[PDB]
Every structure is written in structure tokens, then in C-alpha cells.
PDB file of all heavy atoms in Angstrom:
ATOM      1  N   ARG A  15       4.360 -69.836  -4.389  1.00  0.00           N
ATOM      2  CA  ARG A  15       4.701 -70.110  -5.817  1.00  0.00           C
ATOM      3  C   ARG A  15       6.154 -69.709  -6.106  1.00  0.00           C
ATOM      4  O   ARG A  15       6.546 -68.579  -5.893  1.00  0.00           O
ATOM      5  CB  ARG A  15       3.738 -69.239  -6.625  1.00  0.00           C
ATOM      6  CG  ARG A  15       3.810 -69.635  -8.104  1.00  0.00           C
ATOM      7  CD  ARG A  15       2.711 -70.651  -8.417  1.00  0.00           C
ATOM      8  NE  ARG A  15       2.247 -70.307  -9.789  1.00  0.00           N
ATOM      9  CZ  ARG A  15       0.982 -70.438 -10.100  1.00  0.00           C
ATOM     10  NH1 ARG A  15       0.435 -71.624 -10.106  1.00  0.00           N
ATOM     11  NH2 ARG A  15       0.276 -69.397 -10.415  1.00  0.00           N
ATOM     12  N   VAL A  16       6.950 -70.631  -6.587  1.00  0.00           N
ATOM     13  CA  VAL A  16       8.383 -70.318  -6.894  1.00  0.00           C
ATOM     14  C   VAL A  16       8.829 -71.067  -8.152  1.00  0.00           C
ATOM     15  O   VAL A  16       8.380 -72.163  -8.426  1.00  0.00           O
ATOM     16  CB  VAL A  16       9.171 -70.788  -5.670  1.00  0.00           C
ATOM     17  CG1 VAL A  16       8.713 -70.009  -4.433  1.00  0.00           C
ATOM     18  CG2 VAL A  16       8.942 -72.286  -5.439  1.00  0.00           C
ATOM     19  N   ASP A  17       9.710 -70.477  -8.919  1.00  0.00           N
ATOM     20  CA  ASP A  17      10.193 -71.144 -10.170  1.00  0.00           C
ATOM     21  C   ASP A  17      11.477 -71.932  -9.895  1.00  0.00           C
ATOM     22  O   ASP A  17      11.512 -73.136 -10.016  1.00  0.00           O
ATOM     23  CB  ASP A  17      10.466 -69.996 -11.152  1.00  0.00           C
ATOM     24  CG  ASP A  17      10.142 -70.463 -12.573  1.00  0.00           C
ATOM     25  OD1 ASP A  17       8.972 -70.682 -12.857  1.00  0.00           O
ATOM     26  OD2 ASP A  17      11.065 -70.589 -13.357  1.00  0.00           O
ATOM     27  N   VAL A  18      12.531 -71.248  -9.522  1.00  0.00           N
ATOM     28  CA  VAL A  18      13.824 -71.947  -9.248  1.00  0.00           C
ATOM     29  C   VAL A  18      13.890 -72.364  -7.778  1.00  0.00           C
ATOM     30  O   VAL A  18      13.936 -71.528  -6.888  1.00  0.00           O
ATOM     31  CB  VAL A  18      14.917 -70.918  -9.570  1.00  0.00           C
ATOM     32  CG1 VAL A  18      16.299 -71.536  -9.330  1.00  0.00           C
ATOM     33  CG2 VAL A  18      14.803 -70.493 -11.034  1.00  0.00           C
ATOM     34  N   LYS A  19      13.906 -73.645  -7.512  1.00  0.00           N
ATOM     35  CA  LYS A  19      13.966 -74.130  -6.101  1.00  0.00           C
ATOM     36  C   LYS A  19      15.344 -74.731  -5.805  1.00  0.00           C
ATOM     37  O   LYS A  19      15.866 -74.586  -4.714  1.00  0.00           O
ATOM     38  CB  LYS A  19      12.883 -75.207  -6.003  1.00  0.00           C
ATOM     39  CG  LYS A  19      11.502 -74.555  -6.041  1.00  0.00           C
ATOM     40  CD  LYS A  19      11.021 -74.451  -7.498  1.00  0.00           C
ATOM     41  CE  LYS A  19       9.563 -74.905  -7.599  1.00  0.00           C
ATOM     42  NZ  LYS A  19       9.623 -76.317  -8.054  1.00  0.00           N
ATOM     43  N   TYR A  20      15.929 -75.398  -6.766  1.00  0.00           N
ATOM     44  CA  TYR A  20      17.275 -76.018  -6.543  1.00  0.00           C
ATOM     45  C   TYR A  20      18.287 -75.455  -7.538  1.00  0.00           C
ATOM     46  O   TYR A  20      17.975 -74.591  -8.341  1.00  0.00           O
ATOM     47  CB  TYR A  20      17.079 -77.519  -6.794  1.00  0.00           C
ATOM     48  CG  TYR A  20      16.058 -78.071  -5.829  1.00  0.00           C
ATOM     49  CD1 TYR A  20      14.694 -77.865  -6.061  1.00  0.00           C
ATOM     50  CD2 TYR A  20      16.475 -78.801  -4.703  1.00  0.00           C
ATOM     51  CE1 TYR A  20      13.749 -78.387  -5.175  1.00  0.00           C
ATOM     52  CE2 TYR A  20      15.525 -79.316  -3.820  1.00  0.00           C
ATOM     53  CZ  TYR A  20      14.158 -79.109  -4.055  1.00  0.00           C
ATOM     54  OH  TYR A  20      13.222 -79.626  -3.179  1.00  0.00           O
ATOM     55  N   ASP A  21      19.494 -75.948  -7.502  1.00  0.00           N
ATOM     56  CA  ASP A  21      20.542 -75.477  -8.442  1.00  0.00           C
ATOM     57  C   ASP A  21      20.648 -76.448  -9.621  1.00  0.00           C
ATOM     58  O   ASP A  21      21.691 -77.022  -9.874  1.00  0.00           O
ATOM     59  CB  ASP A  21      21.834 -75.464  -7.627  1.00  0.00           C
ATOM     60  CG  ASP A  21      22.777 -74.388  -8.175  1.00  0.00           C
ATOM     61  OD1 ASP A  21      22.408 -73.227  -8.129  1.00  0.00           O
ATOM     62  OD2 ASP A  21      23.845 -74.747  -8.638  1.00  0.00           O
ATOM     63  N   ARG A  22      19.564 -76.648 -10.328  1.00  0.00           N
ATOM     64  CA  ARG A  22      19.577 -77.598 -11.487  1.00  0.00           C
ATOM     65  C   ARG A  22      20.628 -77.189 -12.523  1.00  0.00           C
ATOM     66  O   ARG A  22      20.346 -76.457 -13.459  1.00  0.00           O
ATOM     67  CB  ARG A  22      18.169 -77.533 -12.097  1.00  0.00           C
ATOM     68  CG  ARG A  22      17.801 -76.074 -12.431  1.00  0.00           C
ATOM     69  CD  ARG A  22      16.735 -75.569 -11.454  1.00  0.00           C
ATOM     70  NE  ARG A  22      15.460 -75.628 -12.216  1.00  0.00           N
ATOM     71  CZ  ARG A  22      14.976 -74.545 -12.768  1.00  0.00           C
ATOM     72  NH1 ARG A  22      15.483 -74.102 -13.888  1.00  0.00           N
ATOM     73  NH2 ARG A  22      13.987 -73.911 -12.205  1.00  0.00           N
ATOM     74  N   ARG A  23      21.836 -77.668 -12.368  1.00  0.00           N
ATOM     75  CA  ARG A  23      22.920 -77.324 -13.340  1.00  0.00           C
ATOM     76  C   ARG A  23      24.041 -78.361 -13.240  1.00  0.00           C
ATOM     77  O   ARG A  23      24.036 -79.203 -12.365  1.00  0.00           O
ATOM     78  CB  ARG A  23      23.416 -75.944 -12.914  1.00  0.00           C
ATOM     79  CG  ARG A  23      23.840 -75.149 -14.153  1.00  0.00           C
ATOM     80  CD  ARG A  23      22.683 -74.247 -14.605  1.00  0.00           C
ATOM     81  NE  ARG A  23      23.243 -73.442 -15.728  1.00  0.00           N
ATOM     82  CZ  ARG A  23      23.448 -73.998 -16.890  1.00  0.00           C
ATOM     83  NH1 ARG A  23      22.463 -74.573 -17.524  1.00  0.00           N
ATOM     84  NH2 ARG A  23      24.638 -73.974 -17.425  1.00  0.00           N
ATOM     85  N   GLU A  24      25.003 -78.309 -14.134  1.00  0.00           N
ATOM     86  CA  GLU A  24      26.135 -79.295 -14.114  1.00  0.00           C
ATOM     87  C   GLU A  24      25.574 -80.732 -14.205  1.00  0.00           C
ATOM     88  O   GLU A  24      25.458 -81.278 -15.279  1.00  0.00           O
ATOM     89  CB  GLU A  24      26.882 -79.059 -12.796  1.00  0.00           C
ATOM     90  CG  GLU A  24      27.988 -78.023 -13.014  1.00  0.00           C
ATOM     91  CD  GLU A  24      29.188 -78.362 -12.119  1.00  0.00           C
ATOM     92  OE1 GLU A  24      29.701 -79.457 -12.231  1.00  0.00           O
ATOM     93  OE2 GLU A  24      29.566 -77.505 -11.334  1.00  0.00           O
ATOM     94  N   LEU A  25      25.225 -81.333 -13.089  1.00  0.00           N
ATOM     95  CA  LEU A  25      24.660 -82.711 -13.131  1.00  0.00           C
ATOM     96  C   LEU A  25      23.189 -82.639 -13.561  1.00  0.00           C
ATOM     97  O   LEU A  25      22.357 -82.109 -12.857  1.00  0.00           O
ATOM     98  CB  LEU A  25      24.777 -83.236 -11.698  1.00  0.00           C
ATOM     99  CG  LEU A  25      25.982 -84.176 -11.593  1.00  0.00           C
ATOM    100  CD1 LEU A  25      26.232 -84.527 -10.123  1.00  0.00           C
ATOM    101  CD2 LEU A  25      25.702 -85.461 -12.381  1.00  0.00           C
ATOM    102  N   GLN A  26      22.878 -83.158 -14.718  1.00  0.00           N
ATOM    103  CA  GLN A  26      21.466 -83.111 -15.213  1.00  0.00           C
ATOM    104  C   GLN A  26      20.504 -83.769 -14.209  1.00  0.00           C
ATOM    105  O   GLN A  26      19.311 -83.520 -14.241  1.00  0.00           O
ATOM    106  CB  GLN A  26      21.472 -83.892 -16.527  1.00  0.00           C
ATOM    107  CG  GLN A  26      21.951 -82.978 -17.662  1.00  0.00           C
ATOM    108  CD  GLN A  26      21.440 -83.513 -19.003  1.00  0.00           C
ATOM    109  OE1 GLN A  26      21.992 -84.451 -19.539  1.00  0.00           O
ATOM    110  NE2 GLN A  26      20.410 -82.950 -19.564  1.00  0.00           N
ATOM    111  N   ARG A  27      21.002 -84.600 -13.327  1.00  0.00           N
ATOM    112  CA  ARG A  27      20.113 -85.268 -12.321  1.00  0.00           C
ATOM    113  C   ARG A  27      19.286 -84.226 -11.551  1.00  0.00           C
ATOM    114  O   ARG A  27      18.088 -84.374 -11.383  1.00  0.00           O
ATOM    115  CB  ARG A  27      21.055 -86.005 -11.370  1.00  0.00           C
ATOM    116  CG  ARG A  27      21.120 -87.484 -11.755  1.00  0.00           C
ATOM    117  CD  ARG A  27      21.483 -88.319 -10.523  1.00  0.00           C
ATOM    118  NE  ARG A  27      22.960 -88.154 -10.376  1.00  0.00           N
ATOM    119  CZ  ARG A  27      23.696 -89.174 -10.021  1.00  0.00           C
ATOM    120  NH1 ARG A  27      24.126 -90.020 -10.917  1.00  0.00           N
ATOM    121  NH2 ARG A  27      23.999 -89.350  -8.766  1.00  0.00           N
ATOM    122  N   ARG A  28      19.919 -83.174 -11.096  1.00  0.00           N
ATOM    123  CA  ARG A  28      19.171 -82.111 -10.347  1.00  0.00           C
ATOM    124  C   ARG A  28      18.089 -81.507 -11.243  1.00  0.00           C
ATOM    125  O   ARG A  28      16.988 -81.230 -10.803  1.00  0.00           O
ATOM    126  CB  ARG A  28      20.220 -81.059  -9.985  1.00  0.00           C
ATOM    127  CG  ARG A  28      20.929 -81.467  -8.693  1.00  0.00           C
ATOM    128  CD  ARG A  28      21.985 -82.532  -9.009  1.00  0.00           C
ATOM    129  NE  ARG A  28      22.650 -82.811  -7.703  1.00  0.00           N
ATOM    130  CZ  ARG A  28      23.908 -83.142  -7.668  1.00  0.00           C
ATOM    131  NH1 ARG A  28      24.266 -84.387  -7.869  1.00  0.00           N
ATOM    132  NH2 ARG A  28      24.819 -82.234  -7.435  1.00  0.00           N
ATOM    133  N   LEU A  29      18.383 -81.326 -12.505  1.00  0.00           N
ATOM    134  CA  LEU A  29      17.364 -80.759 -13.444  1.00  0.00           C
ATOM    135  C   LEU A  29      16.173 -81.709 -13.541  1.00  0.00           C
ATOM    136  O   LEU A  29      15.049 -81.289 -13.740  1.00  0.00           O
ATOM    137  CB  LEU A  29      18.075 -80.651 -14.801  1.00  0.00           C
ATOM    138  CG  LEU A  29      17.571 -79.412 -15.539  1.00  0.00           C
ATOM    139  CD1 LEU A  29      18.645 -78.925 -16.512  1.00  0.00           C
ATOM    140  CD2 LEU A  29      16.305 -79.762 -16.315  1.00  0.00           C
ATOM    141  N   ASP A  30      16.412 -82.988 -13.374  1.00  0.00           N
ATOM    142  CA  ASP A  30      15.295 -83.971 -13.430  1.00  0.00           C
ATOM    143  C   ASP A  30      14.452 -83.832 -12.170  1.00  0.00           C
ATOM    144  O   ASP A  30      13.255 -84.027 -12.183  1.00  0.00           O
ATOM    145  CB  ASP A  30      15.963 -85.347 -13.495  1.00  0.00           C
ATOM    146  CG  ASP A  30      15.362 -86.164 -14.645  1.00  0.00           C
ATOM    147  OD1 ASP A  30      14.357 -86.819 -14.419  1.00  0.00           O
ATOM    148  OD2 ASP A  30      15.918 -86.115 -15.724  1.00  0.00           O
ATOM    149  N   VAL A  31      15.080 -83.476 -11.070  1.00  0.00           N
ATOM    150  CA  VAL A  31      14.323 -83.298  -9.802  1.00  0.00           C
ATOM    151  C   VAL A  31      13.318 -82.154  -9.963  1.00  0.00           C
ATOM    152  O   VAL A  31      12.175 -82.261  -9.575  1.00  0.00           O
ATOM    153  CB  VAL A  31      15.377 -82.951  -8.740  1.00  0.00           C
ATOM    154  CG1 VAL A  31      14.691 -82.745  -7.385  1.00  0.00           C
ATOM    155  CG2 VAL A  31      16.378 -84.102  -8.624  1.00  0.00           C
ATOM    156  N   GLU A  32      13.747 -81.061 -10.555  1.00  0.00           N
ATOM    157  CA  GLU A  32      12.820 -79.904 -10.764  1.00  0.00           C
ATOM    158  C   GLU A  32      11.644 -80.341 -11.634  1.00  0.00           C
ATOM    159  O   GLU A  32      10.498 -80.072 -11.322  1.00  0.00           O
ATOM    160  CB  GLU A  32      13.652 -78.837 -11.475  1.00  0.00           C
ATOM    161  CG  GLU A  32      14.464 -78.052 -10.442  1.00  0.00           C
ATOM    162  CD  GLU A  32      13.714 -76.780 -10.061  1.00  0.00           C
ATOM    163  OE1 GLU A  32      13.075 -76.199 -10.924  1.00  0.00           O
ATOM    164  OE2 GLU A  32      13.780 -76.399  -8.899  1.00  0.00           O
ATOM    165  N   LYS A  33      11.918 -81.030 -12.722  1.00  0.00           N
ATOM    166  CA  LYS A  33      10.809 -81.511 -13.605  1.00  0.00           C
ATOM    167  C   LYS A  33       9.897 -82.445 -12.803  1.00  0.00           C
ATOM    168  O   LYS A  33       8.685 -82.359 -12.867  1.00  0.00           O
ATOM    169  CB  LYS A  33      11.493 -82.265 -14.744  1.00  0.00           C
ATOM    170  CG  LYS A  33      10.529 -82.382 -15.931  1.00  0.00           C
ATOM    171  CD  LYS A  33      11.025 -83.474 -16.882  1.00  0.00           C
ATOM    172  CE  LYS A  33      10.016 -83.651 -18.027  1.00  0.00           C
ATOM    173  NZ  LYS A  33      10.667 -84.589 -18.971  1.00  0.00           N
ATOM    174  N   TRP A  34      10.488 -83.331 -12.040  1.00  0.00           N
ATOM    175  CA  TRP A  34       9.687 -84.275 -11.202  1.00  0.00           C
ATOM    176  C   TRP A  34       8.798 -83.475 -10.244  1.00  0.00           C
ATOM    177  O   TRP A  34       7.639 -83.793 -10.047  1.00  0.00           O
ATOM    178  CB  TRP A  34      10.736 -85.123 -10.451  1.00  0.00           C
ATOM    179  CG  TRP A  34      10.115 -85.879  -9.314  1.00  0.00           C
ATOM    180  CD1 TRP A  34       9.292 -86.940  -9.433  1.00  0.00           C
ATOM    181  CD2 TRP A  34      10.258 -85.625  -7.886  1.00  0.00           C
ATOM    182  NE1 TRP A  34       8.921 -87.364  -8.165  1.00  0.00           N
ATOM    183  CE2 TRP A  34       9.493 -86.590  -7.183  1.00  0.00           C
ATOM    184  CE3 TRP A  34      10.967 -84.677  -7.136  1.00  0.00           C
ATOM    185  CZ2 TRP A  34       9.433 -86.604  -5.795  1.00  0.00           C
ATOM    186  CZ3 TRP A  34      10.912 -84.685  -5.736  1.00  0.00           C
ATOM    187  CH2 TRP A  34      10.141 -85.646  -5.065  1.00  0.00           C
ATOM    188  N   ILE A  35       9.327 -82.423  -9.657  1.00  0.00           N
ATOM    189  CA  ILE A  35       8.508 -81.602  -8.720  1.00  0.00           C
ATOM    190  C   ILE A  35       7.333 -80.983  -9.481  1.00  0.00           C
ATOM    191  O   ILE A  35       6.213 -81.015  -9.028  1.00  0.00           O
ATOM    192  CB  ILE A  35       9.444 -80.507  -8.186  1.00  0.00           C
ATOM    193  CG1 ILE A  35      10.559 -81.166  -7.366  1.00  0.00           C
ATOM    194  CG2 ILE A  35       8.662 -79.527  -7.291  1.00  0.00           C
ATOM    195  CD1 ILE A  35      11.792 -80.263  -7.351  1.00  0.00           C
ATOM    196  N   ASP A  36       7.574 -80.449 -10.657  1.00  0.00           N
ATOM    197  CA  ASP A  36       6.453 -79.851 -11.447  1.00  0.00           C
ATOM    198  C   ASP A  36       5.409 -80.928 -11.749  1.00  0.00           C
ATOM    199  O   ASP A  36       4.226 -80.674 -11.731  1.00  0.00           O
ATOM    200  CB  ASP A  36       7.090 -79.339 -12.736  1.00  0.00           C
ATOM    201  CG  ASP A  36       7.778 -78.000 -12.467  1.00  0.00           C
ATOM    202  OD1 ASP A  36       7.108 -77.094 -12.009  1.00  0.00           O
ATOM    203  OD2 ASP A  36       8.968 -77.908 -12.727  1.00  0.00           O
ATOM    204  N   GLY A  37       5.854 -82.125 -12.030  1.00  0.00           N
ATOM    205  CA  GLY A  37       4.903 -83.230 -12.340  1.00  0.00           C
ATOM    206  C   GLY A  37       4.264 -83.756 -11.052  1.00  0.00           C
ATOM    207  O   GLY A  37       3.051 -83.874 -10.955  1.00  0.00           O
ATOM    208  N   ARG A  38       5.061 -84.064 -10.060  1.00  0.00           N
ATOM    209  CA  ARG A  38       4.497 -84.580  -8.783  1.00  0.00           C
ATOM    210  C   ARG A  38       3.702 -83.494  -8.073  1.00  0.00           C
ATOM    211  O   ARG A  38       2.577 -83.703  -7.686  1.00  0.00           O
ATOM    212  CB  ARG A  38       5.724 -85.011  -7.949  1.00  0.00           C
ATOM    213  CG  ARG A  38       5.301 -85.412  -6.523  1.00  0.00           C
ATOM    214  CD  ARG A  38       4.272 -86.545  -6.571  1.00  0.00           C
ATOM    215  NE  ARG A  38       4.951 -87.668  -7.271  1.00  0.00           N
ATOM    216  CZ  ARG A  38       4.506 -88.085  -8.423  1.00  0.00           C
ATOM    217  NH1 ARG A  38       3.254 -88.421  -8.564  1.00  0.00           N
ATOM    218  NH2 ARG A  38       5.321 -88.174  -9.440  1.00  0.00           N
ATOM    219  N   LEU A  39       4.277 -82.326  -7.893  1.00  0.00           N
ATOM    220  CA  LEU A  39       3.543 -81.227  -7.191  1.00  0.00           C
ATOM    221  C   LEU A  39       2.238 -80.915  -7.928  1.00  0.00           C
ATOM    222  O   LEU A  39       1.212 -80.694  -7.303  1.00  0.00           O
ATOM    223  CB  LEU A  39       4.491 -80.026  -7.194  1.00  0.00           C
ATOM    224  CG  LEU A  39       4.123 -79.056  -6.071  1.00  0.00           C
ATOM    225  CD1 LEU A  39       4.276 -79.745  -4.714  1.00  0.00           C
ATOM    226  CD2 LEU A  39       5.056 -77.837  -6.132  1.00  0.00           C
ATOM    227  N   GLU A  40       2.254 -80.923  -9.236  1.00  0.00           N
ATOM    228  CA  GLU A  40       0.988 -80.659  -9.990  1.00  0.00           C
ATOM    229  C   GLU A  40      -0.005 -81.790  -9.719  1.00  0.00           C
ATOM    230  O   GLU A  40      -1.203 -81.614  -9.825  1.00  0.00           O
ATOM    231  CB  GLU A  40       1.376 -80.636 -11.464  1.00  0.00           C
ATOM    232  CG  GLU A  40       1.900 -79.245 -11.836  1.00  0.00           C
ATOM    233  CD  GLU A  40       0.747 -78.247 -11.843  1.00  0.00           C
ATOM    234  OE1 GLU A  40      -0.083 -78.332 -12.733  1.00  0.00           O
ATOM    235  OE2 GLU A  40       0.709 -77.412 -10.955  1.00  0.00           O
ATOM    236  N   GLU A  41       0.495 -82.958  -9.364  1.00  0.00           N
ATOM    237  CA  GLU A  41      -0.418 -84.112  -9.086  1.00  0.00           C
ATOM    238  C   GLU A  41      -0.685 -84.246  -7.577  1.00  0.00           C
ATOM    239  O   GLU A  41      -1.660 -84.844  -7.160  1.00  0.00           O
ATOM    240  CB  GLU A  41       0.331 -85.338  -9.599  1.00  0.00           C
ATOM    241  CG  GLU A  41       0.155 -85.444 -11.122  1.00  0.00           C
ATOM    242  CD  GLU A  41      -1.141 -86.204 -11.419  1.00  0.00           C
ATOM    243  OE1 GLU A  41      -1.262 -87.339 -10.983  1.00  0.00           O
ATOM    244  OE2 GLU A  41      -1.992 -85.643 -12.086  1.00  0.00           O
ATOM    245  N   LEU A  42       0.183 -83.709  -6.758  1.00  0.00           N
ATOM    246  CA  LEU A  42      -0.002 -83.809  -5.278  1.00  0.00           C
ATOM    247  C   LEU A  42      -1.254 -83.048  -4.831  1.00  0.00           C
ATOM    248  O   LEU A  42      -1.807 -83.325  -3.787  1.00  0.00           O
ATOM    249  CB  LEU A  42       1.243 -83.164  -4.671  1.00  0.00           C
ATOM    250  CG  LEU A  42       2.403 -84.160  -4.652  1.00  0.00           C
ATOM    251  CD1 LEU A  42       3.665 -83.457  -4.149  1.00  0.00           C
ATOM    252  CD2 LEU A  42       2.066 -85.318  -3.728  1.00  0.00           C
ATOM    253  N   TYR A  43      -1.682 -82.079  -5.603  1.00  0.00           N
ATOM    254  CA  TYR A  43      -2.881 -81.282  -5.203  1.00  0.00           C
ATOM    255  C   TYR A  43      -3.994 -81.431  -6.243  1.00  0.00           C
ATOM    256  O   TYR A  43      -5.025 -82.028  -5.975  1.00  0.00           O
ATOM    257  CB  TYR A  43      -2.402 -79.822  -5.115  1.00  0.00           C
ATOM    258  CG  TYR A  43      -1.147 -79.730  -4.270  1.00  0.00           C
ATOM    259  CD1 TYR A  43      -0.005 -79.102  -4.790  1.00  0.00           C
ATOM    260  CD2 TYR A  43      -1.124 -80.285  -2.988  1.00  0.00           C
ATOM    261  CE1 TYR A  43       1.159 -79.035  -4.015  1.00  0.00           C
ATOM    262  CE2 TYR A  43       0.039 -80.214  -2.213  1.00  0.00           C
ATOM    263  CZ  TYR A  43       1.183 -79.587  -2.727  1.00  0.00           C
ATOM    264  OH  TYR A  43       2.332 -79.517  -1.966  1.00  0.00           O
ATOM    265  N   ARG A  44      -3.806 -80.899  -7.427  1.00  0.00           N
ATOM    266  CA  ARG A  44      -4.847 -81.007  -8.496  1.00  0.00           C
ATOM    267  C   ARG A  44      -6.233 -80.578  -7.966  1.00  0.00           C
ATOM    268  O   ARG A  44      -7.113 -81.394  -7.770  1.00  0.00           O
ATOM    269  CB  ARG A  44      -4.863 -82.484  -8.898  1.00  0.00           C
ATOM    270  CG  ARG A  44      -5.599 -82.644 -10.231  1.00  0.00           C
ATOM    271  CD  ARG A  44      -4.644 -82.299 -11.381  1.00  0.00           C
ATOM    272  NE  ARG A  44      -5.500 -82.290 -12.595  1.00  0.00           N
ATOM    273  CZ  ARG A  44      -5.360 -83.215 -13.508  1.00  0.00           C
ATOM    274  NH1 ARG A  44      -4.177 -83.473 -13.993  1.00  0.00           N
ATOM    275  NH2 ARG A  44      -6.400 -83.880 -13.928  1.00  0.00           N
ATOM    276  N   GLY A  45      -6.420 -79.302  -7.738  1.00  0.00           N
ATOM    277  CA  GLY A  45      -7.731 -78.818  -7.224  1.00  0.00           C
ATOM    278  C   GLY A  45      -7.637 -78.551  -5.720  1.00  0.00           C
ATOM    279  O   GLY A  45      -8.575 -78.795  -4.981  1.00  0.00           O
ATOM    280  N   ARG A  46      -6.520 -78.045  -5.263  1.00  0.00           N
ATOM    281  CA  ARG A  46      -6.358 -77.761  -3.805  1.00  0.00           C
ATOM    282  C   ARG A  46      -5.094 -76.927  -3.571  1.00  0.00           C
ATOM    283  O   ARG A  46      -3.995 -77.439  -3.601  1.00  0.00           O
ATOM    284  CB  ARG A  46      -6.235 -79.126  -3.139  1.00  0.00           C
ATOM    285  CG  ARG A  46      -6.905 -79.094  -1.764  1.00  0.00           C
ATOM    286  CD  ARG A  46      -7.625 -80.415  -1.504  1.00  0.00           C
ATOM    287  NE  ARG A  46      -8.067 -80.344  -0.086  1.00  0.00           N
ATOM    288  CZ  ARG A  46      -9.134 -79.670   0.238  1.00  0.00           C
ATOM    289  NH1 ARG A  46      -9.038 -78.399   0.539  1.00  0.00           N
ATOM    290  NH2 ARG A  46     -10.299 -80.258   0.260  1.00  0.00           N
ATOM    291  N   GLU A  47      -5.254 -75.644  -3.346  1.00  0.00           N
ATOM    292  CA  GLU A  47      -4.064 -74.774  -3.117  1.00  0.00           C
ATOM    293  C   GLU A  47      -3.614 -74.850  -1.657  1.00  0.00           C
ATOM    294  O   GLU A  47      -2.450 -75.057  -1.371  1.00  0.00           O
ATOM    295  CB  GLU A  47      -4.537 -73.358  -3.452  1.00  0.00           C
ATOM    296  CG  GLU A  47      -4.683 -73.221  -4.971  1.00  0.00           C
ATOM    297  CD  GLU A  47      -4.651 -71.736  -5.354  1.00  0.00           C
ATOM    298  OE1 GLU A  47      -3.751 -71.053  -4.900  1.00  0.00           O
ATOM    299  OE2 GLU A  47      -5.524 -71.320  -6.093  1.00  0.00           O
ATOM    300  N   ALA A  48      -4.524 -74.671  -0.728  1.00  0.00           N
ATOM    301  CA  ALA A  48      -4.162 -74.719   0.731  1.00  0.00           C
ATOM    302  C   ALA A  48      -3.010 -73.750   1.032  1.00  0.00           C
ATOM    303  O   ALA A  48      -2.281 -73.911   1.994  1.00  0.00           O
ATOM    304  CB  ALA A  48      -3.723 -76.168   0.995  1.00  0.00           C
ATOM    305  N   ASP A  49      -2.841 -72.734   0.215  1.00  0.00           N
ATOM    306  CA  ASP A  49      -1.745 -71.729   0.422  1.00  0.00           C
ATOM    307  C   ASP A  49      -0.354 -72.363   0.282  1.00  0.00           C
ATOM    308  O   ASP A  49       0.643 -71.731   0.571  1.00  0.00           O
ATOM    309  CB  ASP A  49      -1.942 -71.165   1.841  1.00  0.00           C
ATOM    310  CG  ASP A  49      -1.598 -69.678   1.852  1.00  0.00           C
ATOM    311  OD1 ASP A  49      -0.449 -69.352   1.601  1.00  0.00           O
ATOM    312  OD2 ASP A  49      -2.484 -68.885   2.122  1.00  0.00           O
TER     313      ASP A  49
END
């Protein structure tokens, strides 16, 4: 479990990647931690 993974700053594009990870990662498992 980690909060800051990339340097989401300056170019808002990187900040969109973090949001995408929270949305995709939350959907990549949905009922499956697997550590």
C-alpha cells in the first residue's frame, strides 16, 4: 500500500496518471488483495 508513487507535479498529465491508477488499480482487483 503506497500513496505517492510518481512525481505528480508541474505537468498535470502525471497527476492524471495517479488518479488513473487509483481508478484502474481499484478495478484491477475488487475483492482480491494477493499481497
